[PDB]
């Protein structure tokens, strides 16, 4: 349908707070569409507010993308032809643009106070809650000269065109704002500082962005942006207006956007719990898109191959922790055991949940639990019984399994285990089955539950015999002996 589009897309977050999963969804959609089409992914930091902005947040945005495996073609660290890529560094570019806009009559200096606007609404019998009145379009040279001579500091406003402001949204379809409905808008504050309304569309133009893919909560900015892009083409600064694609807002439990105050929106809360990049990328891909109607499990290469903005839906995109957890668990199970073992060791070690097993033993234990967890952190509760200072016999398990009958099972197993020549899972198994099954004719649940509770503290544990092997003879014997009291 048919030539591949020529694509330059951006991810343009503000460095305020922690990396919001809606915003990371938007990064991924941009990245996937670039990679699908052989296009360029531009990373721009929109840091024009010193009050809210922080270097901690900047570094965390870089870390978020790198951890997720989403590399950028132009942006911080890497550079590129249209830099610098932090807006805090492009002050001189914005001043030039403003100057050019002002000299073409695309933009003008405006001196009204909000109170003078309100008073003009009242005299004309207009709703005084309405906005800017375009009064300053029509200032005489003398009146303009006269405001400056009084020390008025103007703002720069853009002169809106007279026609409709409309585009065909790649996700939302046709959108139109009527001729005259949008007041001439401020591109600066009275200090001269440029506002989002200048810097965002200006850098999209200057960085030659072809497709703007962003959350649909920003849709209302688009007409103002269209106006500015048009002005920038007239003054020879840009060439083409980008296409726009507005992505479904990521919701929490109701109709409301998932909040930045809500810990579920924090990418790194998921990290800390033990999401892996492959899990979380798969999940975030499902927040407005879908590889197939018959399955939702996929990797990044599969997404790159399949992803087109034409297939983004505008249906409600609700964040569902259960689904995210389920996909993470599938992705965990897809890892090669060596990869998984290294990731799991590092996760536990770096969250002060060291497991008291040597490297090869821990690998063996990791192998045993790869199919039992939804997130890496869950392995602590499953494996901490290897740590003598964490082991505790659950009192309900004890009451049920460590009665006189179970006590009797331990007596037999303990004598069984002394005959085990080498302390390995098969010989442990054989000794205990010889004694408890072949010998005492016990039902397996009856033969083994007391030994599992004794050795692990609980009625559910990793494979019992393997677990006994890794605990070692001395520890296993000690626990079994104590369990009978
Ligand atoms: Cl969102």
Swiss-Prot record:
Chain span(s) of sequence motif 'HIGH' region: 13-23
Miscellaneous comment in the UniProt entry for this protein: Was identified as a high-confidence drug target.
EC number in record: 6.1.1.17
Organism expressing this protein natively: Mycobacterium tuberculosis (strain ATCC 25618 / H37Rv)
Superkingdom classification of source: Bacteria
Binding site for ATP: 260
Assembly and binders: Monomer.
UniProt cross-references to Pfam families, sorted A to Z: Anticodon_2, tRNA-synt_1c
Molecular-function GO term, any one: ATP binding
Compartments in which it is found: Cytoplasm
CDD domains named among the record's database cross-references: GluRS_core
Family of the protein in this entry: Belongs to the class-I aminoacyl-tRNA synthetase family. Glutamate--tRNA ligase type 1 subfamily.
Cellular component terms per the entry's GO annotation: cytosol; plasma membrane
Catalytic activity line of the entry: tRNA(Glu) + L-glutamate + ATP = L-glutamyl-tRNA(Glu) + AMP + diphosphate
Keyword Thylakoid belongs to the record: no
Name by which UniProt lists this protein: Glutamate--tRNA ligase
